[PDB]
Amino acid sequence: HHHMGAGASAEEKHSRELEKKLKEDAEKDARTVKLLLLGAGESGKSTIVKQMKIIHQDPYSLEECLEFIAIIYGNTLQSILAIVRAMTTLNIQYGDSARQDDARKLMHMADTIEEGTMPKEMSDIIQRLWKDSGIQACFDRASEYQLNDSAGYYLSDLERLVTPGYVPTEQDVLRSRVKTTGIIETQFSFKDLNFRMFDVGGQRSERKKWIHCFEGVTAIIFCVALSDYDLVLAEDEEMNRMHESMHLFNSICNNKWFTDTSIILFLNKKDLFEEKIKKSPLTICYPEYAGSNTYEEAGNYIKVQFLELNMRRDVKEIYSHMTCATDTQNVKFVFDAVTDIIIKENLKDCGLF
Numbered sequence: 087h088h089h090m091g092a093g094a095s096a097e098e099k100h101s102r103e104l105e106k107k108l109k110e111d112a113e114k115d116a117r118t119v120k121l122l123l124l125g126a127g128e129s130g131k132s133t134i135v136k137q138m139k140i141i142h143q144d145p146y147s148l149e150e151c152l153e154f155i156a157i158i159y160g161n162t163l164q165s166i167l168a169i170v171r172a173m174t175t176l177n178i179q180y181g182d183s184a185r186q187d188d189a190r191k192l193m194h195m196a197d198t199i200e201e202g203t204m205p206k207e208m209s210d211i212i213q214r215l216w217k218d219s220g221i222q223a224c225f226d227r228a229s230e231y232q233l234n235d236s237a238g239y240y241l242s243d244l245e246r247l248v249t250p251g252y253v254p255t256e257q258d259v260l261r262s263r264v265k266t267t268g269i270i271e272t273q274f275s276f277k278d279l280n281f282r283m284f285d286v287g288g289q290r291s292e293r294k295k296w297i298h299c300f301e302g303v304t305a306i307i308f309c310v311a312l313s314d315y316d317l318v319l320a321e322d323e324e325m326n327r328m329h330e331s332m333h334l335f336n337s338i339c340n341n342k343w344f345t346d347t348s349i350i351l352f353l354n355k356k357d358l359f360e361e362k363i364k365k366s367p368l369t370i371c372y373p374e375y376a377g378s379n380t381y382e383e384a385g386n387y388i389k390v391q392f393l394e395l396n397m398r399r400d401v402k403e404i405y406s407h408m409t410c411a412t413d414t415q416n417v418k419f420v421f422d423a424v425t426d427i428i429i430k431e432n433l434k435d436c437g438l439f
């Protein structure tokens with residue numbers, strides 16, 4: 087009857103009490119889900135993070151959207167530049183000799199102008215170059231050199247991007263690229279769950295092992311660029327880019343970190359692969375490959391090759407998905423599915439009321 091007084095028990099409980107110690111019961115957050123984003127560089131880790139914001143967080147604001155303009159220009163510049171350098175590297179002829187002096191004037195401008203800026207004289211040079219048949223012949227051969235996968239996407243809409251008062255569309259943002267070595271993080275809610283997602287870069291460089299001691303990691307999301315199978319190695323390294331991604335994934339399953347962690351394979355860039363597979367045989371990456379060179383069988387073949395690297399017999403623990411990170415609708419499906427696997431396999435006791 088008396089709340090501040092008390093009326094229960096019999097000389098068992100005395101002195102001051104600690105139910106405000108049982109406040110750590112409220113600190114019990116099993117609705118917290120930590121995911122590591124691992125994978126080679128340029129495999130789509132950042133893009134996934136961006137998507138998480140677009141889909142579950144509030145999408146990018148107009149102030150944020152405008153902060154990409156400067157990276158989106160650099161991205162475009164860097165891209166045309168890469169093509170132009172490959173004109174000489176692959177020794178490809180300009181469609182119209184006159185376009186050769188534009189390309190010379192570009193090297194000049196690029197080295198002078200302010201990083202992130204796209205002056206009208208530059209974009210005109212770039213717009214012509216793009217329409218040139220030489221550049222286009224060189225563009226189709228992007229596989230023989232280092233080219234942003236977003237190069238085309240941007241150079242196709244270059245005009246739309248230099249019209250004053252330009253606003254980056256969600257896709258544009260999604261297509262941008264900013265190399266980092268450290269860790270990008272993002273926190274968002276979904277399904278009454280707080281998600282903390284960690285994008286871990288510098289895997290081919292440092293390959294830090296402290297990542298293991300990270301506590302509370304529900305699942306590992308490992309990205310692979312499907313469209314990397316095509317890239318020829320001038321490195322002479324034992325394994326091209328596809329087999330390099332495999333060597334990185336091999337040490338993710340090979341590593342016997344015992345905290346309960348599901349691993350999820352994102353075979354990313356399925357859209358670009360769908361274009362490549364018809365032209366470039368999957369035998370380029372796997373010579374033993376007897377199957378046909380089509381999206382279904384080749385994609386599957388690659389998936390297998392990755393799943394087959396599974397060192398520890400992970401009892402119902404290797405999940406995989408063909409993904410297109412820049413495609414929101416797609417990511418919304420894959421992440422729905424991932425969540426559904428998380429909540430079941432790593433389940434807190436069910437509420438049931």
Ligand SMILES: Nc1nc2c(ncn2[C@@H]2O[C@H](COP(=O)(O)OP(=O)(O)O)[C@@H](O)[C@H]2O)c(=O)[nH]1
Nearest residue numbers: 127128129130131132133236261355410411412
């Ligand atoms: N077409 C296509 N482009 C993608 C996809 N994922 C990423 N990209 C682009 O590929 C480039 C490299 O991706 P990024 O996230 O920067 O790679 P990171 O180095 O792993 O962070 C960027 O220009 C992205 O816009 C994808 O699924 N499809």
